[PDB]
Amino acid sequence: HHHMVDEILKLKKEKGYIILAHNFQIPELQDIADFVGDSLQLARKAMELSEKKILFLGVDFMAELVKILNPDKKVIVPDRSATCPMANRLTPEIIREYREKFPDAPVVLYVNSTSECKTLADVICTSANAVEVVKKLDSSVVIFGPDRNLGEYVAEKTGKKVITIPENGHCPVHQFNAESIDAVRKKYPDAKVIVHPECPKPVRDKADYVGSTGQMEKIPERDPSRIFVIGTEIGMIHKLKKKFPDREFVPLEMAVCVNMKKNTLENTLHALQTESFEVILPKEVIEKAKKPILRMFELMG
Ligand SMILES: O=C(O)c1ccc(S)nc1C(=O)O
Ligand code: SF4
Ligand SMILES: [Cl-]
Numbered sequence: 001h002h003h004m005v006d007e008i009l010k011l012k013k014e015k016g017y018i019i020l021a022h023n024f025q026i027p028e029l030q031d032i033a034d035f036v037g038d039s040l041q042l043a044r045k046a047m048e049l050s051e052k053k054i055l056f057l058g059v060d061f062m063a064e065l066v067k068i069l070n071p072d073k074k075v076i077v078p079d080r081s082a083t084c085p086m087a088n089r090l091t092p093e094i095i096r097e098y099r100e101k102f103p104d105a106p107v108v109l110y111v112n113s114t115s116e117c118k119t120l121a122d123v124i125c126t127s128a129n130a131v132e133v134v135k136k137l138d139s140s141v142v143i144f145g146p147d148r149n150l151g152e153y154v155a156e157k158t159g160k161k162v163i164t165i166p167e168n169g170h171c172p173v174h175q176f177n178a179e180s181i182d183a184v185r186k187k188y189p190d191a192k193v194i195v196h197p198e199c200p201k202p203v204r205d206k207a208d209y210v211g212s213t214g215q216m217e218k219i220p221e222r223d224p225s226r227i228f229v230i231g232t233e234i235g236m237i238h239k240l241k242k243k244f245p246d247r248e249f250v251p252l253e254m255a256v257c258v259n260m261k262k263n264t265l266e267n268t269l270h271a272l273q274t275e276s277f278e279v280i281l282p283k284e285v286i287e288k289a290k291k292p293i294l295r296m297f298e299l300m301g
Pocket of ligand 1: 037038127
């Protein structure tokens, strides 16, 4: 690890790579990254860079997001199989089926979606902006995927009708038990519970705050509470504890995204040695997927 970390830092400098790491990476990889953040934060950061080579540490749809918004940069990932099972359950066939049945409902796709699915979306959204995006659409009905929990949250906050696809679209990592909140309230009476909107409704409704990872790291800037209980993937505990060393961050439960943990010091070192595996999308996919991303930027403009 001493070897691997030094060799990584050496090869990144030597070959002109910037390392971008998602919040759900292992701490060792967060610590060697130039920037750690959420998928949109990392894509927007990449647009600002003078460097034309990126080593991306996350899962495929996010690396592809970076590539869509930075087509002329070389983007490589250490494990080409790192993917989002939830994203992968939504298909072009299901989107087209639902557009045909509800032709007046805009297709709002969570950024946790395949690039192919993005080519068919009317607008992209993040967990932070989903409510605001859906509020600003003309329609009082939207098609939303692939996360049924976030879709239902959006319906609650907007009062709009949200038709969720696919059937039972969810993120296994965020299926905490509401009983975990009951238990931490007893154990740390003054702790603030922050959970993800991908969490099920009973968990959301028992939390002090519901928010994206990006929103979670901003809450201690306005809430002086000593202890925060965190209902997301375990990588966020490391991120939060680094940003706010003066507070305590307690996992609601241990929750690990197996795909996020496919990236390691070893295979990150192999990626810089070989300059593989490059993220390549057909130009047509990039052009089409860009349209609902730009719409998102326009709506949040
Ligand atoms: O930031 C978020 O809340 C979030 C949660 C899960 C996953 S895979 N990604 C993200 C994100 O980068 O937006
Ligand atoms: S944490 Fe959930 S939403 Fe994020 S990549 Fe892993 S399975 Fe997909
Ligand atoms: Cl570019």
